[PDB]
Design an enzyme around this catalytic site. Structure first.
Site, PDB file in Angstrom:
ATOM      1  N   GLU A  31       0.856  -1.245   0.016  1.00 21.82           N
ATOM      2  CA  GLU A  31      -0.106   0.105  -0.293  1.00 21.82           C
ATOM      3  C   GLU A  31       0.819   1.340  -0.129  1.00 21.82           C
ATOM      4  O   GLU A  31       2.014   1.266   0.693  1.00 21.82           O
ATOM      5  CB  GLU A  31      -0.983  -0.036   1.294  1.00 21.82           C
ATOM      6  CG  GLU A  31      -2.228   0.800   1.107  1.00 21.82           C
ATOM      7  CD  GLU A  31      -3.502   0.315   1.989  1.00 21.82           C
ATOM      8  OE1 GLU A  31      -4.388   0.146   1.457  1.00 21.82           O
ATOM      9  OE2 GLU A  31      -3.105   0.334   3.182  1.00 21.82           O
ATOM     10  N   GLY A  33       0.784   6.000  -0.793  1.00 22.43           N
ATOM     11  CA  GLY A  33      -0.181   7.077  -0.658  1.00 22.43           C
ATOM     12  C   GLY A  33      -1.210   7.347  -1.828  1.00 22.43           C
ATOM     13  O   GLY A  33      -1.868   8.037  -2.021  1.00 22.43           O
ATOM     14  N   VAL A  37      -1.123  -1.974  -4.492  1.00 24.88           N
ATOM     15  CA  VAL A  37      -0.643  -3.221  -5.396  1.00 24.88           C
ATOM     16  C   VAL A  37      -1.049  -4.491  -5.167  1.00 24.88           C
ATOM     17  O   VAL A  37      -1.046  -4.791  -3.898  1.00 24.88           O
ATOM     18  CB  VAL A  37       1.084  -2.784  -5.387  1.00 24.88           C
ATOM     19  CG1 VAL A  37       1.570  -3.659  -6.571  1.00 24.88           C
ATOM     20  CG2 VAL A  37       1.443  -1.393  -5.615  1.00 24.88           C
ATOM     21  N   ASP A 144      10.984  10.484  -4.628  1.00 23.08           N
ATOM     22  CA  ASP A 144      10.274   9.791  -3.643  1.00 23.08           C
ATOM     23  C   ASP A 144      11.168   8.492  -3.333  1.00 23.08           C
ATOM     24  O   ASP A 144      10.949   7.333  -3.266  1.00 23.08           O
ATOM     25  CB  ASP A 144       9.031   9.247  -4.082  1.00 23.08           C
ATOM     26  CG  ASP A 144       8.133   8.861  -2.922  1.00 23.08           C
ATOM     27  OD1 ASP A 144       8.549   9.249  -1.816  1.00 23.08           O
ATOM     28  OD2 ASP A 144       7.113   8.199  -3.140  1.00 23.08           O
ATOM     29  N   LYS A 146      12.924   5.744  -1.296  1.00 24.76           N
ATOM     30  CA  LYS A 146      12.762   5.311  -0.075  1.00 24.76           C
ATOM     31  C   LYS A 146      12.867   3.768  -0.105  1.00 24.76           C
ATOM     32  O   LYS A 146      12.553   3.093  -1.251  1.00 24.76           O
ATOM     33  CB  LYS A 146      11.342   5.823   0.617  1.00 24.76           C
ATOM     34  CG  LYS A 146      10.248   5.402  -0.280  1.00 24.76           C
ATOM     35  CD  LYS A 146       8.915   6.141   0.505  1.00 24.76           C
ATOM     36  CE  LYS A 146       7.793   5.598  -0.191  1.00 24.76           C
ATOM     37  NZ  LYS A 146       6.447   6.107   0.526  1.00 24.76           N
TER      38      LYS A 146
HETATM   39  C1  LIG Z   1       5.853  -3.782  -0.767  1.00 23.83           C
HETATM   40  C2  LIG Z   1       5.489  -4.200  -2.513  1.00 23.83           C
HETATM   41  C3  LIG Z   1       4.163  -3.250  -2.716  1.00 23.83           C
HETATM   42  N1  LIG Z   1       3.188  -2.916  -3.117  1.00 23.83           N
HETATM   43  N2  LIG Z   1       5.442  -5.541  -2.726  1.00 23.83           N
HETATM   44  C4  LIG Z   1       5.681  -5.808  -4.145  1.00 23.83           C
HETATM   45  C5  LIG Z   1       5.812  -5.184  -5.277  1.00 23.83           C
HETATM   46  C6  LIG Z   1       5.855  -5.738  -6.530  1.00 23.83           C
HETATM   47  C7  LIG Z   1       6.239  -4.713  -7.567  1.00 23.83           C
HETATM   48  C8  LIG Z   1       6.732  -4.978  -8.950  1.00 23.83           C
HETATM   49  C9  LIG Z   1       6.847  -3.991  -9.744  1.00 23.83           C
HETATM   50  C10 LIG Z   1       6.351  -2.993  -8.909  1.00 23.83           C
HETATM   51  C11 LIG Z   1       5.992  -1.585  -9.273  1.00 23.83           C
HETATM   52  C12 LIG Z   1       5.478  -0.568  -8.346  1.00 23.83           C
HETATM   53  C13 LIG Z   1       5.259   0.754  -8.526  1.00 23.83           C
HETATM   54  N3  LIG Z   1       4.930   1.833  -8.765  1.00 23.83           N
HETATM   55  C14 LIG Z   1       4.978  -1.283  -6.988  1.00 23.83           C
HETATM   56  N4  LIG Z   1       5.241  -2.443  -6.742  1.00 23.83           N
HETATM   57  N5  LIG Z   1       5.824  -3.120  -7.472  1.00 23.83           N
HETATM   58  N6  LIG Z   1       6.029  -6.862  -6.839  1.00 23.83           N
HETATM   59  C15 LIG Z   1       5.661  -7.761  -5.744  1.00 23.83           C
HETATM   60  C16 LIG Z   1       5.649  -7.373  -4.420  1.00 23.83           C
HETATM   61  C17 LIG Z   1       5.468  -8.541  -3.260  1.00 23.83           C
HETATM   62  O1  LIG Z   1       4.926  -8.041  -2.100  1.00 23.83           O
HETATM   63  N7  LIG Z   1       6.005  -9.636  -3.481  1.00 23.83           N
HETATM   64  C18 LIG Z   1       5.951 -10.705  -2.850  1.00 23.83           C
HETATM   65  C19 LIG Z   1       7.035 -10.863  -1.766  1.00 23.83           C
HETATM   66  F1  LIG Z   1       7.130  -9.577  -0.977  1.00 23.83           F
HETATM   67  C20 LIG Z   1       6.545 -11.733  -0.536  1.00 23.83           C
HETATM   68  C21 LIG Z   1       8.008 -12.110   0.569  1.00 23.83           C
HETATM   69  C22 LIG Z   1       6.413 -13.210  -1.310  1.00 23.83           C
HETATM   70  O2  LIG Z   1       5.443 -11.773   0.244  1.00 23.83           O
END
Ligand SMILES: C[C@H](C#N)Nc1cc(-c2ccc3cc(C#N)cnn23)ncc1C(=O)NC[C@@H](F)C(C)(C)O
Length: 285
Positions: A31, A33, A37, A144, A146
């Site tokens: 999540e 702001g 996703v 941004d 972080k």
């Molecule tokens: C925290 C974050 C979020 N939101 N997580 C993910 C993001 C993303 C992802 C890929 C491309 C992009 C682009 C944007 C933007 N603009 C945002 N995300 N993004 N692909 C996966 C996860 C995820 O959680 N994979 C599972 C793994 F974590 C686990 C340990 C098996 O649980």
């Protein structure tokens, strides 16, 4: 190029944007702001679908900006955009799914992932620096930076994400970003690449300590206040080294903290550029 999806297709692949966590069979992965996703499968390809959710026109500006930056910036340390959906009042962006989520979530060991080794933390910081370098080499300011916006693939390769606030010294009337990471000049309205370097210094502090940049239930609340305690010699960086590691030597940790403290100069022109940050991190290993 990019694939134009119909919104109902992304509705199907995300199981009606199931807000239950992926850890229990849902689709919600994170999540921010500006949206949520979700995990999905598009043609056997695991994807990340960010549904945007500030004015509506402003959200369209960040939606259009992310596509325009992703169309030109392809690099192993940047996430990859697969497509988008713009029909209706809902905006969606489809990326290649990141198997290890965000650096923030892995530093906190969210969902039971094991603590990152110091050796892997060093390689992640180097990869994130190479990603920032590619964007700065192509005249783009992230605005941004972080740990939540540094993602990790199957081999923990660092990939920068979220370019909706990116820009190509200038002022603005709408100050945006995460306050816990923002440089002093960015909190006032300045748009400049030196602000990205300052935010990267906070990430290096997060990597060293494992503490998030802001924690309401913590004292100090802001990780930057802990750096000040170290400058005044009331504490040292060894007192804050992440205890969830067993391979952290004091020499390499102090070397990363030196890069962090250089990045965190209040005066932007005293901060190093991303190329110097890259070399200092390579010399650290
Ligand atoms: C925290 C974050 C979020 N939101 N997580 C993910 C993001 C993303 C992802 C890929 C491309 C992009 C682009 C944007 C933007 N603009 C945002 N995300 N993004 N692909 C996966 C996860 C995820 O959680 N994979 C599972 C793994 F974590 C686990 C340990 C098996 O649980």
């Amino acid at each position: 190029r990019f694939h134009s999806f119909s919104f109902y297709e992304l509705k199907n692949v995300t199981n009606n944007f199931d807000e239950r966590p992926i850890s229990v069979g849902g689709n919600k992965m994170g999540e921010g702001g500006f949206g949520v996703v979700y995990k999905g499968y598009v043609n056997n390809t695991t994807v990340a679908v960010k549904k945007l959710a500030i004015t509506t026109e402003e959200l369209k500006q960040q939606f259009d900006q992310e596509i325009k930056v992703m169309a030109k910036c392809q690099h192993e340390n940047l996430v990859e955009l697969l497509g988008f959906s713009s029909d209706g009042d809902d905006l969606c962006l489809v990326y290649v799914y990141m198997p290890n989520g965000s650096l923030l979530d892995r530093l906190s060991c969210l969902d039971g992932t094991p603590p990152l080794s110091w050796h892997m933390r060093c390689k992640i910081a180097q990869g994130a620096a190479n990603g920032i370098n590619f964007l700065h080499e192509n005249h783009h300011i992230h605005r941004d930076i972080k740990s939540a916006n540094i993602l990790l693939d199957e081999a923990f390769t660092a990939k920068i994400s979220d370019f909706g606030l990116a820009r190509a010294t200038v002022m603005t009337s709408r100050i945006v970003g995460t306050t816990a990471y923002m440089a002093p000049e960015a909190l006032r309205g300045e748009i400049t690449p030196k602000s990205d370097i300052y935010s990267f210094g906070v990430v290096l502090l997060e990597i060293i300590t494992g503490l998030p940049a802001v924690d309401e239930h913590r004292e100090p609340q802001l990780l930057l206040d802990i750096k000040e305690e170290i400058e005044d010699e009331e504490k040292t960086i060894e007192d804050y080294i992440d205890k969830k590691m067993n391979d952290a030597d004091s020499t390499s940790v102090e070397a990363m903290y030196s890069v962090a403290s250089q990045c965190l100069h209040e005066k932007k022109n005293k901060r190093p550029d991303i190329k110097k940050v890259q070399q200092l991190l390579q010399e650290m290993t």
